[PDB]
Coordinates of C-alpha atoms in Angstrom, one line a residue:
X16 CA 0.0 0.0 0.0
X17 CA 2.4 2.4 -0.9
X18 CA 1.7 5.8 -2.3
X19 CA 3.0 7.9 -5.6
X20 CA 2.1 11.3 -6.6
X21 CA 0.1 12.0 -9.9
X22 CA 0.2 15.6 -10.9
X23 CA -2.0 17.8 -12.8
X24 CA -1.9 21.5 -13.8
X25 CA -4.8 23.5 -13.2
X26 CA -6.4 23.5 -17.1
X27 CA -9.4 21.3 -17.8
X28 CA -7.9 18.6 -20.0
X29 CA -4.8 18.6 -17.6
X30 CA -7.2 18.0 -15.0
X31 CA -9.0 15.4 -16.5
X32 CA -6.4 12.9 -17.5
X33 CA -4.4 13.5 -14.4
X34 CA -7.5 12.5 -12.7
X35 CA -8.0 9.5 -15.6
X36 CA -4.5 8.7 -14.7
X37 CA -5.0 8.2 -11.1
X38 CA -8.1 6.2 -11.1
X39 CA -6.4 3.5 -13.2
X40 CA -3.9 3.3 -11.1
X41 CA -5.7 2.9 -7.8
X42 CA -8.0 0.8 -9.9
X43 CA -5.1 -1.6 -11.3
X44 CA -2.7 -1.3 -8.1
X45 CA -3.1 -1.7 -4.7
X46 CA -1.2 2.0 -5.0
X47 CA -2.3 5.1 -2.7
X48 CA -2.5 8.0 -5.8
X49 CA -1.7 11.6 -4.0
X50 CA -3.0 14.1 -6.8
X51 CA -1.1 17.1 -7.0
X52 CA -1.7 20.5 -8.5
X53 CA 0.5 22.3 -9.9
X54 CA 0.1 26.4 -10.6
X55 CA 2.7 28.2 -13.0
X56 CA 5.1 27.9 -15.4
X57 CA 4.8 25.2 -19.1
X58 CA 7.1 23.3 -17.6
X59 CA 5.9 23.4 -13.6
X60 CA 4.6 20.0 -14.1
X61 CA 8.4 18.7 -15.7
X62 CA 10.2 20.9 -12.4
X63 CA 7.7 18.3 -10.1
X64 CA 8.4 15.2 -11.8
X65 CA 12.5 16.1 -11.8
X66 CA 12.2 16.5 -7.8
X67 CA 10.1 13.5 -7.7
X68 CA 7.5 12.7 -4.7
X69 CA 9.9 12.4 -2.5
X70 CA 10.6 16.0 -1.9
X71 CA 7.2 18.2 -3.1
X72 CA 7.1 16.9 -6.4
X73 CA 5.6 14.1 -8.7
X74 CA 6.2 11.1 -9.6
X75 CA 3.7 10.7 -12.7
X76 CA 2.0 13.0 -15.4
X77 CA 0.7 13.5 -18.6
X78 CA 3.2 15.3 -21.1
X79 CA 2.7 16.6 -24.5
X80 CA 5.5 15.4 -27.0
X81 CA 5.4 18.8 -29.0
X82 CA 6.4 20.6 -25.4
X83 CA 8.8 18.1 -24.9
X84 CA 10.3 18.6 -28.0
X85 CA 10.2 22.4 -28.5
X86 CA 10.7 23.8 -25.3
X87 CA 12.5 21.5 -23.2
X88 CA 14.7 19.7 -25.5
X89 CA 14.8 22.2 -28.3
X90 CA 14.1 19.8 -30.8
X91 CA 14.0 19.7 -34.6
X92 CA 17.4 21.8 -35.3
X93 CA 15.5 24.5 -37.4
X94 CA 14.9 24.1 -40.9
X95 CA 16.8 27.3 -42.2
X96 CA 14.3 29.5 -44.3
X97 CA 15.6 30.8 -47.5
X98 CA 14.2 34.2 -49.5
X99 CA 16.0 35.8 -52.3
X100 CA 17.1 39.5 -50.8
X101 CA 17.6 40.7 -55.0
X102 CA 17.8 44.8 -53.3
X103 CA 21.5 42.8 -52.8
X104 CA 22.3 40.2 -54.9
X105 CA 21.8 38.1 -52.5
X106 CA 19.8 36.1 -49.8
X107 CA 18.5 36.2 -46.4
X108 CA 17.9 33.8 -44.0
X109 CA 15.9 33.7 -40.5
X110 CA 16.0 30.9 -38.1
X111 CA 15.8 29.8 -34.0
X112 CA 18.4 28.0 -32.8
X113 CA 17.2 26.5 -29.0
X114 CA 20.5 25.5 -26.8
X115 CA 19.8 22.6 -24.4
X116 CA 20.5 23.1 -20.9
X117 CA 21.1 20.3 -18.3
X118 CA 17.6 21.7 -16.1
X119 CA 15.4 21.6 -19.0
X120 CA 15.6 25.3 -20.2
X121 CA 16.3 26.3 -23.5
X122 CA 18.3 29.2 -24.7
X123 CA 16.6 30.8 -27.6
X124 CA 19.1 31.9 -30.5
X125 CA 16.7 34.1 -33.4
X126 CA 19.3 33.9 -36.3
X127 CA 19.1 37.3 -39.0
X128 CA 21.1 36.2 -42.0
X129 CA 22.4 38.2 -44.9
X130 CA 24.8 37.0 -47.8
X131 CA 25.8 39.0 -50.7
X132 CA 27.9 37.9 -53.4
X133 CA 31.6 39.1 -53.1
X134 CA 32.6 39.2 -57.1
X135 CA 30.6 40.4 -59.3
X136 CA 29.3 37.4 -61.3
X137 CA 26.0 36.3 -62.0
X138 CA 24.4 34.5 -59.3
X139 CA 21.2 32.0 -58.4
X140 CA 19.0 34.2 -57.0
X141 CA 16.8 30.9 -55.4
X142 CA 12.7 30.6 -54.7
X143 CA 11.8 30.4 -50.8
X144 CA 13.1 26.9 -49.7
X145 CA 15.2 26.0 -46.7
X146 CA 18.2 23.9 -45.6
X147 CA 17.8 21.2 -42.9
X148 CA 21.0 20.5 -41.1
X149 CA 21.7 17.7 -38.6
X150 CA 24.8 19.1 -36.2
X151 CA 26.3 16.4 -33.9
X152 CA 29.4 17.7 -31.4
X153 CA 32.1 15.7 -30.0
X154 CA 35.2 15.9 -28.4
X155 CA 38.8 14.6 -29.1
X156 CA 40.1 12.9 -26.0
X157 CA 43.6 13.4 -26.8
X158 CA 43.3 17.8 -27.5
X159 CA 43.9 19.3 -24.7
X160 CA 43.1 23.0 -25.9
X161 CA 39.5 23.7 -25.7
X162 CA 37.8 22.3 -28.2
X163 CA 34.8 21.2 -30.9
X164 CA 34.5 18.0 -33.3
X165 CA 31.5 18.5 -35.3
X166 CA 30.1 16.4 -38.0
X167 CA 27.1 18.3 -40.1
X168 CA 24.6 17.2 -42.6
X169 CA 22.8 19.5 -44.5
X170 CA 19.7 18.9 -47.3
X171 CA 18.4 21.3 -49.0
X172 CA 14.6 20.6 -49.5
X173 CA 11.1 22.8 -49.6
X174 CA 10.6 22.7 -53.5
X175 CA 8.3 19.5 -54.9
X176 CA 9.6 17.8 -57.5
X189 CA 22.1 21.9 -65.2
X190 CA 24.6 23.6 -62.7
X191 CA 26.7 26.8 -61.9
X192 CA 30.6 26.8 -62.3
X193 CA 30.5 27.2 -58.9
X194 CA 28.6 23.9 -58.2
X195 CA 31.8 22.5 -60.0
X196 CA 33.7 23.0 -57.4
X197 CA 31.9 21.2 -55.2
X198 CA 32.2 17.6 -57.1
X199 CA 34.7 16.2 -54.8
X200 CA 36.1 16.4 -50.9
X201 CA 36.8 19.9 -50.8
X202 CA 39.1 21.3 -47.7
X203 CA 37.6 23.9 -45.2
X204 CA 39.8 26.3 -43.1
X205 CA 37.9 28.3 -40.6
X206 CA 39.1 31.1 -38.7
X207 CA 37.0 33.2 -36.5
X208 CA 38.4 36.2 -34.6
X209 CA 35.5 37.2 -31.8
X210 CA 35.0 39.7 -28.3
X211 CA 31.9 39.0 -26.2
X212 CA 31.6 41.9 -23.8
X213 CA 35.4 43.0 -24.6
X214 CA 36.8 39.3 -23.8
X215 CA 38.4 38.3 -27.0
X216 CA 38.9 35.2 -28.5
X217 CA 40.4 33.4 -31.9
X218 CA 39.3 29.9 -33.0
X219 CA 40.6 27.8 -35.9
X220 CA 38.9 24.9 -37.6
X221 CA 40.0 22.2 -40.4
X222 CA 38.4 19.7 -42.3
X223 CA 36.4 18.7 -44.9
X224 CA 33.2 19.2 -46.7
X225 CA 31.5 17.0 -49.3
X226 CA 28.3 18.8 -50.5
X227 CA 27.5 15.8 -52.9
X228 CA 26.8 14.1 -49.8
X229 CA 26.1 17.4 -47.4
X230 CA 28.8 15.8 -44.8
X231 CA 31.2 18.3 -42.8
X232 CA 33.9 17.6 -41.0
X233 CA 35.3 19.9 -38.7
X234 CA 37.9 20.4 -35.8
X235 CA 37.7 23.9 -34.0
X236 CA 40.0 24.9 -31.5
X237 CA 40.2 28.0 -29.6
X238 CA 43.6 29.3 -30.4
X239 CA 43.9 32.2 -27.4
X240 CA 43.2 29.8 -24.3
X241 CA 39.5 29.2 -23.1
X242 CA 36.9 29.9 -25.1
X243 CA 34.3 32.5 -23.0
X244 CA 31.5 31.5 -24.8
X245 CA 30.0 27.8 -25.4
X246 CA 31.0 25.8 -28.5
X247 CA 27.3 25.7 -29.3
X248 CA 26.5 29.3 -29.4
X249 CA 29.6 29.7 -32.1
X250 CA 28.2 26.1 -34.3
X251 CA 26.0 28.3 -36.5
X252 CA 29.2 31.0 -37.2
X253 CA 31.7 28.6 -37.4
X255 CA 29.7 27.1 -44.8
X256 CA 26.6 26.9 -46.4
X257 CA 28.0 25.9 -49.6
X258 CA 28.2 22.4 -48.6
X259 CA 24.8 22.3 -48.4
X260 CA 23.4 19.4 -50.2
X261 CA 20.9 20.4 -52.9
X262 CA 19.0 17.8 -54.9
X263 CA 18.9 17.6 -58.5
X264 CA 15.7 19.3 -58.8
X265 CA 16.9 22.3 -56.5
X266 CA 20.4 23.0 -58.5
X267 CA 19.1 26.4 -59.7
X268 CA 18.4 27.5 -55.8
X269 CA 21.7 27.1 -54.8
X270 CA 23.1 31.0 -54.3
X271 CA 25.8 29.7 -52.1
X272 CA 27.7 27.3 -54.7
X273 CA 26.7 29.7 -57.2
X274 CA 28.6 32.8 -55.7
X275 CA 32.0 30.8 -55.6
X276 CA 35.2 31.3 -56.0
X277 CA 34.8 34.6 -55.3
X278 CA 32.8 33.7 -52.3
X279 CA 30.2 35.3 -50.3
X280 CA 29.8 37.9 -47.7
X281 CA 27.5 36.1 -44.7
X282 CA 26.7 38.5 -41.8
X283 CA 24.3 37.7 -38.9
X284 CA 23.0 39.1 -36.1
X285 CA 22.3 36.2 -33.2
X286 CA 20.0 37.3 -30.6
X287 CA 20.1 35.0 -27.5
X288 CA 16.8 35.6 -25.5
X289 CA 17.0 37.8 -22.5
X290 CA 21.4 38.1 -22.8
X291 CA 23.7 39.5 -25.3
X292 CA 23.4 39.8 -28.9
X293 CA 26.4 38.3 -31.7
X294 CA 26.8 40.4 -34.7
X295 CA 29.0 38.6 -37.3
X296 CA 30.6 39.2 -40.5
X297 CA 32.3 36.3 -42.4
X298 CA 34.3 36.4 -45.9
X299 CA 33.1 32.5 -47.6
X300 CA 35.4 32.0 -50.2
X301 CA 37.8 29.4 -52.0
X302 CA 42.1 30.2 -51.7
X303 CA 43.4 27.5 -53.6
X304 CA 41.8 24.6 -53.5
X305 CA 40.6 25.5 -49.6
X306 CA 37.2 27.3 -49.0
X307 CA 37.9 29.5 -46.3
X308 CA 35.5 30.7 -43.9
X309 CA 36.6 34.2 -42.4
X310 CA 34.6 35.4 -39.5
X311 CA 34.7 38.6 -37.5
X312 CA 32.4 38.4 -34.1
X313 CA 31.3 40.8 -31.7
X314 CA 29.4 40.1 -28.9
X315 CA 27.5 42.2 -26.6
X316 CA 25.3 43.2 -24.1
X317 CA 25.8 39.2 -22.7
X318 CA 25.1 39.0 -18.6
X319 CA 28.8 37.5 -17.3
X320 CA 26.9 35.5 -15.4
X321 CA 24.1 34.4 -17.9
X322 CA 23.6 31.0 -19.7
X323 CA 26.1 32.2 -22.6
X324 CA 29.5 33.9 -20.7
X325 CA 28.6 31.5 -17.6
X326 CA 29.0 28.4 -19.9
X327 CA 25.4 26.3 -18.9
X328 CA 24.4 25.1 -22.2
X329 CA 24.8 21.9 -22.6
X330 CA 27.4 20.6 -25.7
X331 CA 25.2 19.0 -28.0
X332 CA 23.0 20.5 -30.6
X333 CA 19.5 19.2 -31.1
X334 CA 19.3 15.1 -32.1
X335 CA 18.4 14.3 -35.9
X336 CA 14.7 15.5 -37.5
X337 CA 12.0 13.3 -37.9
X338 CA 12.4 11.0 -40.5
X339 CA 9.6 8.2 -39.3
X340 CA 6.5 10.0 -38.0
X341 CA 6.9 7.9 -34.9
X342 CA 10.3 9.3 -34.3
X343 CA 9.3 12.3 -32.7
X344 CA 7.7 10.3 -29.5
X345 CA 10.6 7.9 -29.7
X346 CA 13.0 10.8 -30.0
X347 CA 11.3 12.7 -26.2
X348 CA 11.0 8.8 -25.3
X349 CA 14.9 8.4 -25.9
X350 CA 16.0 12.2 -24.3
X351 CA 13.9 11.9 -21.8
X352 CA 15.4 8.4 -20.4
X353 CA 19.4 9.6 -21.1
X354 CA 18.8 13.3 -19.2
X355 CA 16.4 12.9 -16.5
X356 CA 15.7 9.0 -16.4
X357 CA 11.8 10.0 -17.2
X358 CA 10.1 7.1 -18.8
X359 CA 7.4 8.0 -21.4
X360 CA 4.5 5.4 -21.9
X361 CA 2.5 4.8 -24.7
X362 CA 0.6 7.9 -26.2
X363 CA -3.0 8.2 -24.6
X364 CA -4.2 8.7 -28.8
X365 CA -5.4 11.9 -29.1
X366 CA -3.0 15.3 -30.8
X367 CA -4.0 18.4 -28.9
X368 CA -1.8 20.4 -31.0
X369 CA -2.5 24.5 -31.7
X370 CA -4.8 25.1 -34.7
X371 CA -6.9 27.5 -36.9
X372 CA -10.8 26.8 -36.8
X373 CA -13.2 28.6 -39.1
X374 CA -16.8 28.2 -38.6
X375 CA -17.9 25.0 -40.3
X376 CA -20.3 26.8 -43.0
X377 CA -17.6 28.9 -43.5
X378 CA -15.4 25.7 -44.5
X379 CA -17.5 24.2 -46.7
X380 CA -18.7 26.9 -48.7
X381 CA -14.5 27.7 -49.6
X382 CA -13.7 23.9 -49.6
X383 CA -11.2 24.5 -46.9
X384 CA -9.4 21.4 -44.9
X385 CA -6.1 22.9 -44.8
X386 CA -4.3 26.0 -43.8
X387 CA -3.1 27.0 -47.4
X388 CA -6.5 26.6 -48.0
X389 CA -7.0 29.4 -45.6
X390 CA -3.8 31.4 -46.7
X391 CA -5.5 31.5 -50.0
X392 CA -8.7 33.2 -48.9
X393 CA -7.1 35.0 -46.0
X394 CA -7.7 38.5 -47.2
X395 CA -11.2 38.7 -47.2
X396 CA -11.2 37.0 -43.4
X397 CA -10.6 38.8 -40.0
X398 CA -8.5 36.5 -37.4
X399 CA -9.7 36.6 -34.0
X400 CA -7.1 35.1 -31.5
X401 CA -5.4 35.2 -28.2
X402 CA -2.5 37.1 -27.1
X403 CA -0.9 33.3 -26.6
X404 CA -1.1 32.7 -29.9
X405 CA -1.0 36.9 -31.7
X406 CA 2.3 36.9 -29.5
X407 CA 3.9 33.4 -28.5
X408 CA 7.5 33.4 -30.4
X409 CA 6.3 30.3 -31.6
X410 CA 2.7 31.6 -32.3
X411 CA 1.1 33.8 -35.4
X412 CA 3.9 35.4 -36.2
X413 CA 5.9 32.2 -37.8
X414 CA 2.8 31.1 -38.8
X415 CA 2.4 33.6 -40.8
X416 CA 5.5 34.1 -42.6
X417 CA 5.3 30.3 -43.1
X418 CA 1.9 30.5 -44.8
X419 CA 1.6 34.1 -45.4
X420 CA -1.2 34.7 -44.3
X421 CA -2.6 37.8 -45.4
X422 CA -6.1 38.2 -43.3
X423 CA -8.3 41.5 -43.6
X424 CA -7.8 42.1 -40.1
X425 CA -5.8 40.2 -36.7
X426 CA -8.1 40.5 -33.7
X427 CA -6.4 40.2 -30.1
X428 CA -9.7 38.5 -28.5
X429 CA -9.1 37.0 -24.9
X430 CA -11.7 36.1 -21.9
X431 CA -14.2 35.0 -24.7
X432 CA -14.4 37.3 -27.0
X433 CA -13.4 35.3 -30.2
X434 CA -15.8 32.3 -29.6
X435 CA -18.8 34.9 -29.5
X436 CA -17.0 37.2 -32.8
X437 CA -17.0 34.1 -34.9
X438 CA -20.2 33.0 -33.5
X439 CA -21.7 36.6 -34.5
X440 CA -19.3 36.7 -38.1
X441 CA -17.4 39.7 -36.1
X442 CA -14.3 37.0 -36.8
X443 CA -14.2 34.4 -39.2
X444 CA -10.9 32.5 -37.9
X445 CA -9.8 31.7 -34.5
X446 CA -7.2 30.1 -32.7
X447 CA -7.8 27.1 -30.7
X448 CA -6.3 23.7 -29.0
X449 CA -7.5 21.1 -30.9
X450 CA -9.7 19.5 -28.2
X451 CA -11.1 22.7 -26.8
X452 CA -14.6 21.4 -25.5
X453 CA -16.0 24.8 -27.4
X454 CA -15.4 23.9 -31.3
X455 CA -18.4 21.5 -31.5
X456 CA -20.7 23.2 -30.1
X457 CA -20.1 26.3 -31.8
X458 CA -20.0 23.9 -34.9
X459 CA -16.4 25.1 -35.9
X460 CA -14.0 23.1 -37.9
X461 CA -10.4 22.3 -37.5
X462 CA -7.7 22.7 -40.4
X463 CA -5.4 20.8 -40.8
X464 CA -1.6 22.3 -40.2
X465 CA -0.6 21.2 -43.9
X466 CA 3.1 22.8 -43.4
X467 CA 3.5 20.9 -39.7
X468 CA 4.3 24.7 -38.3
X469 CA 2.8 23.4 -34.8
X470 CA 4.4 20.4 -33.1
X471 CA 2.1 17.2 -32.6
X472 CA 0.7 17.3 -29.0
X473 CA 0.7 13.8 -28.6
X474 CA -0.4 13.3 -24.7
X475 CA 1.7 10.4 -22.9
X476 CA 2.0 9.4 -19.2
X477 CA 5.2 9.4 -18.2
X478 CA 7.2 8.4 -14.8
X479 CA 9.8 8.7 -13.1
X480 CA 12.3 5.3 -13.6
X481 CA 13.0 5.0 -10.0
X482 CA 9.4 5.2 -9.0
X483 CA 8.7 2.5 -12.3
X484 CA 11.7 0.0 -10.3
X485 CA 9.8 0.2 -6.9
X486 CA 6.5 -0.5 -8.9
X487 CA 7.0 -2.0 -12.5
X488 CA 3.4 -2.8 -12.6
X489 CA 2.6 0.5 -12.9
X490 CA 3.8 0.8 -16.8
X491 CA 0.8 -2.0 -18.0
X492 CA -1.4 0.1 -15.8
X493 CA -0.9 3.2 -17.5
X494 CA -0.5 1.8 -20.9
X495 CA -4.1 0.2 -20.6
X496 CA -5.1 3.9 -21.6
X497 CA -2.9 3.4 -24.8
X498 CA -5.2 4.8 -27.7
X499 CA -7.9 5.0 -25.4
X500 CA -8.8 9.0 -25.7
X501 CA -9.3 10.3 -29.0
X502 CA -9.2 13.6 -30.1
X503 CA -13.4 13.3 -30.0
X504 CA -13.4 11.9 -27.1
X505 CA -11.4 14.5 -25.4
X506 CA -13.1 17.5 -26.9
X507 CA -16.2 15.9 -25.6
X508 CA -14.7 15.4 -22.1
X509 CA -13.7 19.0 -22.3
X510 CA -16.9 20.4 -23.1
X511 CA -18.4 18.1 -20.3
X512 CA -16.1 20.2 -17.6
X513 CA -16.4 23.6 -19.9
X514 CA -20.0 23.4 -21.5
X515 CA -21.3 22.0 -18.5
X516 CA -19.9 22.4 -15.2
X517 CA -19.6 18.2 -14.5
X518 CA -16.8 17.6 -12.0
X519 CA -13.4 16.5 -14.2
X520 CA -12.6 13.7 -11.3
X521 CA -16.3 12.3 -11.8
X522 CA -16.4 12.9 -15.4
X523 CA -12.7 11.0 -15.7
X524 CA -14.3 7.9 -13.8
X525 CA -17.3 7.6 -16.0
X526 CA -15.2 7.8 -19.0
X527 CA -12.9 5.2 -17.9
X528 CA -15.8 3.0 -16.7
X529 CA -18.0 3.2 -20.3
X530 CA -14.5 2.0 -21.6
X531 CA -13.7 -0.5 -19.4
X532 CA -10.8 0.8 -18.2
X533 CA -11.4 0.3 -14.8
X534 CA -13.3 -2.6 -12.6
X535 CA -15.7 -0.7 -10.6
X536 CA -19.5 -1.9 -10.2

C-alpha cells in the first residue's frame, strides 16, 4: 500500500487525464494516488516530476511530446528558411536555434542572415526553400586545448519535384579552413577549424580549437558562425543554390544572433575558395551578454538538437529516448489523441470555400478577420511564424481574450480563430479544424510518463498506465472538455465515467 504522486496543472484537459491517470492506477494497483496540483510555469509539471514525490514533487503526469520537443529539448534543429534579398544580390535567411540546458531550459538563439555575393558574377537568386542540417558535437580525448568535433549534414529541400561553375567545385572532398576572430563583452577570443566538406553528400567535418586559451562562450552558441555551400541540394533544386553559385569569389555572410533575455552576436564572415581551400573568415562581436548568464557563464549543454523526424513515430521515440538519457523520465505509450495548436473557421464557412487545410485558408485569407489570443497573436512560436510560413494575409488580426473570439465568430465579427484542438468549445459552436498542412505546430501527442525509479519500486505501474494506450481520442477529449467547460460536470467524476463506459477500470 504504498503511495505515488500524480500531478495535474490546473487546465481542464490537464485535470481530467491526471485524474483519468489516477483512477487506473488505484483501480489496477493496490497503490495510494496523491493528486497534485501544480500552478505556474509550461514546464511546472516537468520541475515536479525532476524533484520527484519524494521531496514536493511528482512522480507521474501526462506530457505533451510537442512541449517536450520544442521547449524543453529544443528539438528539430530548425529548418533554415531561405528568401531571395535581389535589393543585394543576395539572400536572407531567418531561423531559431534552441540551446539545451542540463535543467530543461532552453536558450533561444533568433538567427538574422544576410549574404551578398563578393565578385561580381551572376548568381542563383533561389525561390523560398530552406536547408535542414543535422549538427552532432564531439570531443577529441587526446586535445587538450578547448575544443569542438563537429560532424554536419545538411539537405536542402522545400521545393516538390544543369549547374553553376561554382557547383563544379563542389564535385569532390573539398578542404575547409575556418578562422573566427571574436570579443563577447570585450573578452576576445580566436578559434581555428580544419576539415572537410562534401556537399554531394552534405557531410562536414570539422575540428575547432580555440587558439587564445579558453573559449568565454560555449562551443554551441559559435556552431551556426563557425559554410553553407556544402549544403546538399537535390537535383531538382540545382538552380536554388546562391551559395555554390557565388563561388570562388565567395560570399559575404553576416548575422545578427539574438540569445533571448542576454547578449546579442553580430558577425561578418568572408566565404570563399584560396586555392583549392574554401575559407571561412569570421569577425564576431558580442554584446550586451550577462557575465553570469547562460552564454559567458558556460550552462548550455554541448550538444545540438538530435536528428529531425524521418519516421512520423520518431518524434515520441525521440522525447522517449531524451527523456530516459537526461532525466531518467520514462514516457508510456501515447494516450491517442493530438492536442496540437490550430486555426478553426466556422464550419459553414469551411464548406462553402472547400477549406481542410491551412493554405487553404492562406489563399482566402484577405477577405477574413483573425480573431485570436494574445498566446497565440504573440507566442515566439505563435502567429507570427505562422504567418510568414503561410503568409497569411487576413483583412484584419483580432487580439480576443476572456471570450471574446468564440462569441465574434459566432456573431461573423471574426471568421478565424485560434484554438487547441480538443477545446470542449469547437463542436458546439459547430467550428471546424484545419489541418496544419506545413506541420508549423508540433504534434501534441499526450503520454503518461514516470519517473524510472518510481517505475523499479513498482513495474506494474507501466501495463497500468499503458491500458489507456489509444484509449482517448481527439473526439473523445473535446467531448470530455466540453463536459467540464460546456457543462460544469466535475473532471474527477467525469474521468471515472469515461474510464468505466471504456472498461478501463473494474468498478461496479
Amino acid at each position: 500500500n504504498d503511495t505515488v504522486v500524480v500531478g495535474s496543472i490546473n487546465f481542464t484537459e490537464g485535470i481530467i487525464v491526471a485524474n483519468m491517470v489516477a483512477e487506473m492506477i488505484e483501480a489496477h494497483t493496490d497503490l495510494k494516488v496523491v493528486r497534485k496540483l501544480n500552478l505556474g510555469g509550461e514546464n511546472v509539471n516537468f520541475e515536479a516530476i525532476k524533484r520527484g514525490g519524494a521531496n514536493n514533487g511528482i512522480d507521474i503526469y501526462v506530457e505533451y511530446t510537442g512541449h517536450g520537443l520544442v521547449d524543453i529539448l529544443g528539438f528539430p534543429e530548425p529548418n533554415v528558411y531561405i528568401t531571395a534579398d535581389k535589393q543585394k544580390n543576395g539572400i536572407k535567411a531567418n531561423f531559431k536555434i534552441r540551446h539545451n540546458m542540463e535543467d530543461g531550459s532552453v536558450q533561444l538563439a533568433d538567427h538574422y542572415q544576410q549574404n551578398t555575393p563578393i565578385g561580381d558574377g551572376p548568381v542563383l537568386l533561389p525561390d523560398n526553400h530552406y536547408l535542414s542540417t543535422q549538427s552532432v558535437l564531439s570531443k577529441d580525448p587526446n586535445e587538450k586545448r578547448d575544443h569542438m568535433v563537429l560532424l554536419e549534414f545538411v539537405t536542402a529541400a522545400g521545393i516538390t519535384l544543369s549547374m553553376s561553375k561554382g557547383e563544379e567545385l563542389f564535385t569532390g572532398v573539398v578542404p575547409i579552413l575556418v578562422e573566427l576572430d571574436g570579443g563577447v563583452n570585450g573578452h576576445k577570443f580566436s578559434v581555428r577549424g580544419e576539415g572537410e566538406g562534401d556537399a554531394t553528400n552534405g557531410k562536414l567535418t570539422l575540428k575547432f580549437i580555440c587558439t587564445t586559451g579558453k573559449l568565454p562562450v560555449p562551443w554551441p552558441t559559435l556552431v551556426t558562425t563557425l559554410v553553407q555551400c556544402f549544403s546538399r541540394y537535390p537535383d531538382h533544386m540545382k538552380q536554388h543554390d546562391f551559395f555554390k553559385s557565388a563561388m570562388p569569389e565567395g560570399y559575404v555572410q553576416e548575422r545578427t544572433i539574438s540569445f533571448k533575455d542576454d547578449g546579442t552576436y553580430k558577425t561578418r564572415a568572408e566565404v570563399k575558395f584560396e586555392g583549392d581551400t574554401l575559407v571561412n573568415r569570421i569577425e564576431l562581436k558580442g554584446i550586451d551578454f550577462k557575465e553570469d548568464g547562460n552564454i559567458l557563464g558556460h550552462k548550455l549543454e554541448y550538444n545540438f538538437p538530435p536528428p529531425s523526424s524521418t519516421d512520423p513515430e520518431g518524434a515520441y521515440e525521440t522525447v522517449k529516448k531524451e527523456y530516459k538519457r537526461k532525466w531518467n523520465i520514462v514516457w508510456l505509450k501515447p494516450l491517442g489523441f493530438n492536442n496540437t495548436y490550430t486555426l478553426t473557421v466556422k464550419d459553414e464557412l469551411a464548406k462553402q470555400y472547400n477549406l481542410k487545410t491551412f493554405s487553404d485558408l492562406a489563399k482566402i485569407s484577405d477577405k477574413l478577420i483573425l480573431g485570436a489570443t494574445m498566446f497565440f497573436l504573440e507566442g515566439p512560436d505563435g502567429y507570427p511564424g505562422l504567418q510568414k510560413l503561410y503568409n497569411f494575409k487576413f483583412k484584419h488580426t483580432k487580439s480576443m481574450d476572456m471570450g471574446i473570439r468564440y462569441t465574434a465568430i459566432d456573431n461573423n465579427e471574426v471568421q478565424v480563430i485560434d484554438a487547441w484542438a480538443t477545446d470542449g468549445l469547437l463542436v458546439s459552436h459547430k467550428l471546424k479544424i484545419l489541418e496544419d498542412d506545413k506541420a508549423f505546430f508540433p504534434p501534441y501527442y499526450a503520454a503518461p510518463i514516470i519517473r524510472q525509479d518510481v517505475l523499479d519500486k513498482h513495474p506494474e505501474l507501466k501495463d497500468v498506465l499503458n491500458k489507456l494506450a489509444n484509449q482517448i481520442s481527439l473526439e473523445e477529449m473535446q467531448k470530455l472538455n466540453y463536459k467540464v467547460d460546456g457543462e460544469g460536470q466535475d473532471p474527477a467524476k467525469v474521468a471515472k465515467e469515461f474510464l468505466k463506459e471504456k472498461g478501463l477500470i473494474l468498478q461496479v
